[PDB]
From Swiss-Prot, chain B:
Protein name stated in the entry: RNA polymerase sigma factor RpoD
Domain notes: Contains 4 domains, connected by flexible linkers. In the active conformation, the domains are in an extended conformation, each making extensive interactions with the RNA polymerase catalytic core.
Keyword Transcription regulation: yes
UniProt site positions, description: Interaction with anti-sigma factors: 420
Compartments it resides in: Cytoplasm
Sequence segments annotated as region (Interaction with anti-sigma factors): 442-457
A single BP term in Gene Ontology: negative regulation of DNA-templated transcription
Residue numbers of the full-length protein present here: 92 to 612 of 613
């Protein structure tokens, strides 16, 4: 909208076309990661980590 | 008794109707032929029904229409059409001038050549409608002239019909019957200005239509009769054949439409089947109607049985897709990969995912979730379209921040910046526009803006506006 | 002055039948299509169930086609597809419609139990439906021929009658027919005719029905509904956001079933239009009309026909009626519950360090709860540049903000609530004290009111946002402000267990210990003597103390003396403030006495001293209980040394009786009773052995050889003090435990001969099991029953609130001690306390006015009464109050958490119901069902009968199932003759006179009788005394007041006898009647005044009567209530509580009374 635009004009930001959906640890629970699994569709390219 | 459940109050109601005998079908069909042909002939005997067709063809070759919107073919192409119409016009231009005892034999043939034309149903409907409307027009003057005598001027209808029949146009009845010294005679003088002036349209009809008020009623009366006969017979046939409709509709049961919905759509199919049927081909009406009823059913289901309506070819595609898996289910002793059926099928092959997804039906928002408790699925659907109060506050604050800041600059810089953006004003302004309202116009404005922003860009100031970036 | 047009703040509400045109008023377009969305671009298909054109834009301030996207263009209807660009919220607002081809019955008015269309037309249901299905023809406006107007013919009959009668005879079939009937109907003509017909024939059969019908007709005229309206021409469509299609994860969709239903209705309707334009045979178009009727019926209320199932899913699709109804009730969503912001919950813990005005609140919880406050404060001082930055600060949990939270917490109370909220004390307000940890700390003294143990019970917190809520929380819901039970003036803040064991162990005396018989200057050096180990906590000692007495006029008198007491009592006295006598602490201080201490302290020194006193009592209780080193060992439970012997002798009895049975001397049954009796006696023997041994058997030496006093044994001190345990459970611990019963209830003749201290064996335990499970199941059930009872009760009362101040009547009930059969099962004092005297009472001598008419009798006045011998006090009751539509404070009583007289505007019906219902779990014909039966007014199973009139009676006729009793009064006519079944044994003397309300037989009596043949005061006394019997037998304290308000609601209705204004037998509000005859006795007719007769209606029945339909639709059957109200065009003015809660405006009780009253008077005024 308005002043938002104005603001982006002053600070020169490229505000993204991509929203952040990332999985983050639920609030208040604290622990150590003991394992990770990655399931992939049969036919989609596996990412680097996987 | 009646258990309600309208399937019953239907089944029992149709269950009375007797199955047609083989010959009876021909009886009914013949009745249909008689009935229709009556209205066709009554249309042929109408002069305006001829002249109209003439003017319409004159509109066709004048490029104000197309040959498909007038004729659905004759018995029998465009050149052939041109000459056929030439034939019709010819019989018209002879019959027209013969209206001096002998003409009748030619008028009958005019009817014949007119009968050679298969009109678009819409055109036919227009014709018949126009005729009956003309009869409404006649009824107008008839009831006006009747009521202006009997109800108003106090005259018996018994003696009113006497000088009526056979003329009802000229002044033989109006100006020669008032002097008869009847109790109702001298009374007719008070309305005389109203009757004779409305008589104009009445005699005008015999000019337009080219028929005396006598025949105008006769013709479309016969027409009405024929129409009645037709509808009567056809109805009879449909009511006779409902059992077939039900028997077919029992195949389509769980496709996502109600039983009675099925049988009703199928009933409409049967109606159409009766409408377009011809016994002269020797094709059994049973096996001919089966296709039509099945068509109404299948074509109806695909259309209306979904909360999300989908095109027909799509539905067909989906069905095929459901088959391939039947060949290959046990064949790939799991199920065929989501990408396999893709190569089976003719089309691009990533379309499987899309099509497969779109074809799914929505879930009842009342679908009970755990505990059997009143928590039901829809209760868990959050509003993602609402804006959080936590943000709304910050917006209302941004208004104050920017207002303060533009209150800090020079009023013309503040005006230029408030202008350059939609700030507390409608739309926002093209820099040219900004020039014109300023009268200082061009490259110029942008300079200020740049520096304006520049002033706001480093602090006292930016600190606040900067904190707003997350 | 123009009143106004656009939105003011409304009052009342109106419900009625809706016009085709009125239905069209709401409609912003006709939905012509079953289609919803396009299937790719998910945009709404115009025009259909989901449509942008008819309803609204899909996104805020944006056109559908996309041309006008700017917030500047608002009232513009886009040229392409007209959609005015406005917030998408309106898609949750705007209605629509569908124009039905054929007329259609509204199933709500067809299937409502007294079918509306049917009894309006005076036509049976089956006939109407029959016609609706095209299974028969029905006459309309038959004219004069052969035929009745409502008469129903058949095919052949219609054809025949038509061939005969041409015109001047009219018949139709289907919905169109019924609509023709309703439209042709002239109510006025019927009115005249019916009045005449009423007048002419004298038969009950005729005129009762006649009169009911005419009254119905005039009621329906007065309206504004007209008959055709029950038949639907136009069908409104529910706004689409209220039946949304919204997407899900996996690209999937989910939608309401209303779309399925509406779709069905639309498709069949359109198809009907088609079948009409195609000129289809009758058999077809009729089927389409039936199907459409079925579809519409399914849409409105599903289940009164075929119960249509939703797409692919067996479960029946929910309809609009079900949308209204909800379920698990009886629950309308203000009722069952509503989720609320600014709130939370967790497990609770102790926190004895707390003053009773506060509670430990976890840091994190208080952070998340006060979040907006924290933001606003943070940027108020300037620690945060802007609200955004303030979030980022608290999200960082920066070190500063805790200090700000300390600020926002200070004066700002929070509400604590537990799960089974019973009485009003189930919610209390405290002051938040920031605490490390995730658990809430709840003051011990309050643990009583909450019924909250520490075994993992969870409590919920709520923040009073608005200022009015803060002050309401502090001046009303505050912990310190309710120290007393609303059920009875007795303190609910009474110390519970550890504390009472503390004060008990402190103040008790042994025979001898260190410091025995010495003398000390005062409590100071007594404590000083104890702490240093020189003198025992408990030793007999004379000490100088200074007590005070305020017995001067509002002034404290000081006096000092040598008191013979113990070191413990002396130390404790330091806590007792001011005016209280030393006598109060000089006893042993059991849980009972420790309470009367607090109560006296309250009624003497006031609130504040009582509060701080209570706090101190708790603190010292815990501390000294900890010092005491109380414990429980295995040897602490002492089994009688004589137990085995008792068991042996009692065991010999059984074998005596057994030998007698073998010898036939005693029969089987009598034998069973004998053995059961001997064992039953044995149990009492062992119990009263172990109790003597356990209680006094400390035998200890002082100076001389021996002395014996009450034991210091731990478990004993526990059971005795009132800390915990009781002679029953102790009995089960040491002595043998009970006799059990099989599931049957046949009590086993071999009692458990072993207790818990000894081991039970396999049999004994297996047999104990049934008793255990029956216990758990029973209690768990009595929870539900109690709840149900409270519900019935608040439904019956509610809106009764203290309205006026003084109704000023001398009327009341005569208060005596209950004096039952022994001595004094309850005193006069408790019965008359806190109440207001109806009239000035005498000394035994007279023209001596001790208590002058209406004076709240407080404890002092009551004690003055007790000084003199006064045996009787007439007391104003809520049942007799002259004030209409409520109760005057002057007549209620003082009782509240505060000791002062009840305030104007407090809602007493609610707290009365709550007060009666809270103990309800504690109650074990008898029991809780007895209470329910009483409040329901239910006639017992085998009741007695009371003499209908005074005078000498005698027996006449014979043996026809009834042998008649013919009553003979002195002066009056004989004619009262009652028929009493002769196969019941009578009482009444054939040769003697009997007063009205005498015993003409025995057995319990129906309170209806007690009201009729005895009177109002008699019946209220009967109820109150019986329910009080039930409760008091269980040791439950409930003041008569609450039962008396309940009783007032019970007799609310009364049926007329005489005439001059209203109808003969109408059951009607006495408030209404009495107001109308008091108004009637003067003006009007000089006096036309009408007699009535009081009626007793049970609670569940009295609740049924309510003027407000919004209220009725809550707890009653909604489907019927809305119809039944809609026909009469009933206009709800709110007024009461339930409706105002539902509509979400201020309660017309409480703080709200000021508002509503102020408005209520502004209404119907200038
Ligand atoms: Mg518990
Ligand atoms: Zn548009
Ligand atoms: Zn009163």
């Amino acid at each position: 909208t308005p002043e938002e635009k104005l603001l982006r004009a002053i600070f020169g930001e490229k505000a993204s076309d991509v929203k952040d959906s990332s999985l983050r640890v639920p609030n208040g629970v604290s622990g150590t990661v003991i394992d990770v699994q990655v399931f992939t569709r049969d036919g989609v390219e596996k990412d680097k980590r996987a | 008794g009646r258990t309600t459940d309208p399937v019953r109050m239907y089944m029992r109601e149709m269950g009375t109707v007797e199955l047609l005998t083989r010959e009876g079908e021909i009886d009914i069909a013949k009745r249909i032929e008689d009935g229709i042909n009556q209205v066709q002939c009554s249309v042929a005997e109408y002069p305006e029904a001829i002249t109209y067709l003439l003017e319409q063809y004159d509109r066709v070759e004048a490029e104000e229409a197309r040959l498909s919107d007038l004729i659905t073919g004759f018995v029998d192409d465009p050149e052939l059409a041109r000459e056929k119409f030439a034939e019709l016009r010819a019989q018209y231009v002879v019959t027209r001038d013969t209206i001096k005892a002998t003409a009748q034999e030619e008028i009958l043939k005019l009817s014949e050549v007119f009968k050679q034309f298969r009109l678009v149903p819409k055109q036919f409907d227009y014709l018949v409608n126009s005729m009956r409307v003309m009869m409404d027009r006649v009824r107008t003057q008839e009831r006006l002239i009747m009521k202006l005598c009997v109800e108003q001027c106090k005259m018996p209808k018994k003696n009113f019909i006497t000088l009526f029949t056979g003329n009802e146009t000229s002044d033989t009845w109006f100006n020669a019957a008032i002097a008869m010294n009847k109790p109702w005679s001298e009374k007719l003088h008070d309305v005389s200005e109203e009757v004779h002036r409305a008589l104009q349209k009445l005699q005008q009809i015999e000019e337009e239509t080219g028929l005396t008020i006598e025949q105008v009623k006769d013709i479309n009366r016969r027409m009405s009769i024929g129409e009645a006969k037709a509808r009567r017979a056809k109805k009879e046939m449909v009511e006779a054949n409902l059992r077939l409709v039900i028997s077919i509709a029992k195949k389509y049961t769980n496709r996502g439409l109600q039983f009675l919905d099925l049988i009703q759509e199928g009933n409409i199919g049967l109606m159409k089947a009766v409408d377009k049927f011809e016994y002269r081909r020797g094709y059994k009406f049973s096996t001919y109607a089966t296709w039509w009823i099945r068509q109404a059913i299948t074509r109806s289901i695909a259309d209306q049985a979904r909360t999300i309506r989908i095109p027909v070819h799509m539905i067909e595609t989906i069905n095929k897709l459901n088959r391939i898996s039947r060949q290959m289910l046990q064949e790939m002793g799991r199920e065929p990969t989501p990408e396999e059926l893709a190569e089976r099928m003719l089309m691009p092959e990533d379309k499987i995912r899309k099509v497969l997804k779109i074809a799914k039906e929505p879930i009842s928002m009342e679908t009970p979730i755990g505990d059997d408790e009143d928590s039901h699925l829809g209760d868990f659907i959050e509003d993602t379209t609402l804006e959080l109060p936590l943000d709304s506050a910050t917006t209302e604050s941004l208004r104050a921040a920017t207002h303060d800041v533009l209150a800090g600059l020079t009023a013309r810089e503040a005006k230029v910046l408030r202008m350059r953006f939609g700030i507390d004003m409608n739309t926002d302004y093209t820099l040219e526009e900004v020039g014109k309202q300023f009268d200082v116009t061009r490259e110029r404005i942008r300079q200020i803006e740049a520096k304006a922003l520049r002033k706001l860009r480093h602090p006292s100031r930016s600190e606040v506006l900067r904190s707003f970036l997350d | 002055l123009k009143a106004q047009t656009k939105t003011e703040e409304f009052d009342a509400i109106k419900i009625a039948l809706a016009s085709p045109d009125m239905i069209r008023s709401w409609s912003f377009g006709e939905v012509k299509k079953p289609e919803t969305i396009n299937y790719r671009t998910f945009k709404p298909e115009r025009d259909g169930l989901f449509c942008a054109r008819i309803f609204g834009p899909v996104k805020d301030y944006e056109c559908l086609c996309g041309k006008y996207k700017r917030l500047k263009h608002r009232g513009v209807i886009c040229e392409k597809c007209g959609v005015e660009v406005t917030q998408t919220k309106v898609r949750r607002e705007r209605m629509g419609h569908i124009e039905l081809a054929s007329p259609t019955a509204h199933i709500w008015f067809l299937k409502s139990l007294p079918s509306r269309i049917g009894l309006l037309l005076d036509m049976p249901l089956r006939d109407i439906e029959r016609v609706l299905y095209f299974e028969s023809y029905v006459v309309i406006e038959g004219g004069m021929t052969n035929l009745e107007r409502q008469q129903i013919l058949t095919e052949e009959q219609y054809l025949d009658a038509l061939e005969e009668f041409g015109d001047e005879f009219d018949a139709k079939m289907g919905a169109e027919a019924i609509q023709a009937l309703l439209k042709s109907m002239d109510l006025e003509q019927e009115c005249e005719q019916l009045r005449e017909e009423l007048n002419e024939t004298n038969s009950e059969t005729k005129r009762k029905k006649l009169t009911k019908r005419i009254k119905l007709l005039e009621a329906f005229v007065q309206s504004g509904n007209k008959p055709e309206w029950m038949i639907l021409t136009v069908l409104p469509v529910l706004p689409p956001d209220l039946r949304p299609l919204v997407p899900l994860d996996g690209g999937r969709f989910a939608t309401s079933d209303l779309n399925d239903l509406y779709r069905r209705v639309i498709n069949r309707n359109n198809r009907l239009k088609r079948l009409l334009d195609l000129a289809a045979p009758d058999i077809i178009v009729r089927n389409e009309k039936r199907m459409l009727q079925e579809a519409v019926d399914a849409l409105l209320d599903n289940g009164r026909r075929g119960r249509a199932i939703t797409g692919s899913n067996k479960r029946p699709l929910k309809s609009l009626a079900d949308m209204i109804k909800g379920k698990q009730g009886r629950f309308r969503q203000n009722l069952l519950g509503k989720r609320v912001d600014y709130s939370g919950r967790s497990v609770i813990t102790v926190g004895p360090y707390l003053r009773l005005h506060q509670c430990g609140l976890p840091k994190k919880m208080a952070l998340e709860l006060f979040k907006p406050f924290i933001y606003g404060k943070l940027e108020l001082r300037g620690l945060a540049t802007t609200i955004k930055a303030a979030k980022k600060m608290v999200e960082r949990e920066e070190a500063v903000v805790w200090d700000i939270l300390d600020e926002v917490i200070r004066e700002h109370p929070v509400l604590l609530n537990r799960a089974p909220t019973l009485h009003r004390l189930g919610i209390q307000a405290f002051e938040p004290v920031l605490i490390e940890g995730k658990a809430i700390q709840l003051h011990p003294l309050v643990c009583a009111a909450y019924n909250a143990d520490f075994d993992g019970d969870q409590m919920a917190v709520h923040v009073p946002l608005t200022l009015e809520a803060q002050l309401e929380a502090r001046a009303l819901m505050m912990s310190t402000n309710n120290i007393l039970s609303p059920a009875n003036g007795e303190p609910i803040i009474v110390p519970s267990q550890d504390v009472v064991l503390g004060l008990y162990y402190m103040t008790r005396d042994c025979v001898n210990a260190k410091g025995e018989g010495m003398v000390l200057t005062g409590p100071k050096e007594a404590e000083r003597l104890y702490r240093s180990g020189l003198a025992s906590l408990h030793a007999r000692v004379k000490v100088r103390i200074t007590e005070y007495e305020k017995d001067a006029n509002g002034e404290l008198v000081a006096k000092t003396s040598l008191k013979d007491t113990t070191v413990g009592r002396a130390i404790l006295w330091m806590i007792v403030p001011k005016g209280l006598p030393y006598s109060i602490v000089n006893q042993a201080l059991g849980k009972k006495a420790i309470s009367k201490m607090l109560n006296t302290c309250y009624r003497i020194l006031g609130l504040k001293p009582t509060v701080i006193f209570a706090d101190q009592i708790m603190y010292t209780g815990f501390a000294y209980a900890a010092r005491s080193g109380a414990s429980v060992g295995i040897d602490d439970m002492v089994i009688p040394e004589k137990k085995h012997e008792i068991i042996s002798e009692a065991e010999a009895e059984v074998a005596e009786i057994q030998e007698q049975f073998q010898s036939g001397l005693v029969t089987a049954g009598e034998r069973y009773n004998k053995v059961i009796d001997i064992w039953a006696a044995a149990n009492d023997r062992v119990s009263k052995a172990m109790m003597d041994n356990l209680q006094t058997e400390t035998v200890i030496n002082r100076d001389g050889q021996e002395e014996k006093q009450v034991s210091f044994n731990s478990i004993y001190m526990m059971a005795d003090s009132g800390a915990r345990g009781s002679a029953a459970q102790i009995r089960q611990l040491a002595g043998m435990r009970g006799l059990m019963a099989k599931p049957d209830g046949s009590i086993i003749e071999t009692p458990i001969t072993a207790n818990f201290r000894e081991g039970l064996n396999v049999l004994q335990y297996f047999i104990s099991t049934h008793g255990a499970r029956k216990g758990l199941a029973d209690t768990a059930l009595k929870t539900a029953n109690s709840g149900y009872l409270t519900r019935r009760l608040v439904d019956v009362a509610q809106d009764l609130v203290v309205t006026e101040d003084d109704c000023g009547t001398h009327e009341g009930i005569m208060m005596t001690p209950v004096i039952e059969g022994g001595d004094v099962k309850e005193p006069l004092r408790d019965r008359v306390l806190g109440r207001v005297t109806a009239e000035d009472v005498l000394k035994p001598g007279t023209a001596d006015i001790l208590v002058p008419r209406n004076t709240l009798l407080h404890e002092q006045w009551c004690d003055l009464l007790e000084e003199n011998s006064v045996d009787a006090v007439k007391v104003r009751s809520v049942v007799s109050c002259d004030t209409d539509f409520g109760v005057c404070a002057h007549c209620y009583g003082r009782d509240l958490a505060r000791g002062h007289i009840i305030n104007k505007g407090e809602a007493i019906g609610v707290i009365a119901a709550q007060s009666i219902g809270e103990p309800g779990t504690q109650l074990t014909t008898g029991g809780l069902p007895r209470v329910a039966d009483l409040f329901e007014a239910r006639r017992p199973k085998e009741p007695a009968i009371l003499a209908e009139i005074s005078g000498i009676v005698s027996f006449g006729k014979e043996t026809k199932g009834k042998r008649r009793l013919v009553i003979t009064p002195v002066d009056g006519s004989d004619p009262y003759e009652e028929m009493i079944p002769k196969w019941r044994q009578l009482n009444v003397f054939e040769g003697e006179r009997v007063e009205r309300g005498d015993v003409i037989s025995d057995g319990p009596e129906a309170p209806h009788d007690i009201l009729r043949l005895r009177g109002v005061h008699a019946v209220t006394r009967y109820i109150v005394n019986e329910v009080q019997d039930v409760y008091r037998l269980q040791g439950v304290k409930i003041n008569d007041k609450h039962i008396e308000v309940i009783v007032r609601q019970m007799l609310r209705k009364a049926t007329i006898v005489n005439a001059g204004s209203s109808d003969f037998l109408e059951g009607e509000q006495v408030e209404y009647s009495r107001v109308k005859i008091a108004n009637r006795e003067l003006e009007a007719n000089g006096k036309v005044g009408a007699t009535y007769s009081r009626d007793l209606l049970g609670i569940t029945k009295a609740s049924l009567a309510t003027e407000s339909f919004i209220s009725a639709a809550s707890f009653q059957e909604t489907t019927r209530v809305l119809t039944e109200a809609a026909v009469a065009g009933k206009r709800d003015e709110l007024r009461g509580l339930k409706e105002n809660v539902i509509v979400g405006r201020l309660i017309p009780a409480g703080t709200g009374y000021a508002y509503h009253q102020d408005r209520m008077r502004r209404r119907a005024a200038g």
